[PDB]
């Protein structure tokens, strides 16, 4: 604000919060926090087959 | 001497939740299952000759 009393600044927590909420949760949603796998296929060899 | 005109949308008693990008969970006015989970338990002989 730039009133006759001078200048001043104030952040609106409401608006700011809405953005943060949407941002935070998204990442984990899109990608699965984790997935397990154990015995698989040899992804390497030393000779020709 | 004045009139008020407004716009708006519909609503339902109890909506359903859905997974969206922006919001982790939000309710809509209608949903639908995209994953077949039930099963008759019987093999239908047609069309494929079984
Ligand atoms: C949600 O809103 C939708 C749309 O207003 C409604 O569901 C839809 O209901 C119609 C008719 O019951 C379904 O269409 C049907 O398609 C078959 C295709 O084989 C056809 O044989 C029928 O003659 C009819 O046209 C449509 O699939 C369905 N869509 C969905 C899944 O929403 C309904 O009013 C509300 N609740 C439901 C059922 O989701």
TrEMBL record, chain B:
Q: Which domain of life is it from?
A: Viruses
Q: Where in the cell is it found?
A: Host apical cell membrane; Virion membrane
Signal peptide start and end residues: none
Function comment: Binds to sialic acid-containing receptors on the cell surface, bringing about the attachment of the virus particle to the cell. This attachment induces virion internalization of about two third of the virus particles through clathrin-dependent endocytosis and about one third through a clathrin- and caveolin-independent pathway. Plays a major role in the determination of host range restriction and virulence. Class I viral fusion protein. Binds to sialic acid-containing receptors on the cell surface, bringing about the attachment of the virus particle to the cell. This attachment induces virion internalization either through clathrin-dependent endocytosis or through clathrin- and caveolin-independent pathway. Plays a major role in the determination of host range restriction and virulence. Class I viral fusion protein. Responsible for penetration of the virus into the cell cytoplasm by mediating the fusion of the membrane of the endocytosed virus particle with the endosomal membrane.
Name the family the entry cites.
Answer: Belongs to the influenza viruses hemagglutinin family.
Q: How does it assemble?
A: Homotrimer of disulfide-linked HA1-HA2.
Q: Protein name, please?
A: Hemagglutinin
Tell me the organism. Influenza A virus (A/Aichi/2-1/1968(H3N2))
Q: Which gene encodes it?
A: HA
Counting on the full-length protein, the chain here runs from: 25 to 74 of 566
């Amino acid at each position: 604000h730039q009133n006759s009393e001078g200048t001043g600044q104030a952040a609106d927590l409401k608006s700011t919060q809405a953005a943060i909420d949407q941002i935070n949760g998204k990442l984990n949603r899109v990608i699965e926090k984790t997935n397990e796998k154990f015995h698989q296929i040899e992804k390497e060899f030393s000779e020709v087959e | 001497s004045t009139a008020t005109l407004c716009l708006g949308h519909h609503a339902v008693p109890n909506g359903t939740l859905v997974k969206t990008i922006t919001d982790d969970q939000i309710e809509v006015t209608n949903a639908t299952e995209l994953v077949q989970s039930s099963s008759t338990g019987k093999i239908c002989n047609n069309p494929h000759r079984i």
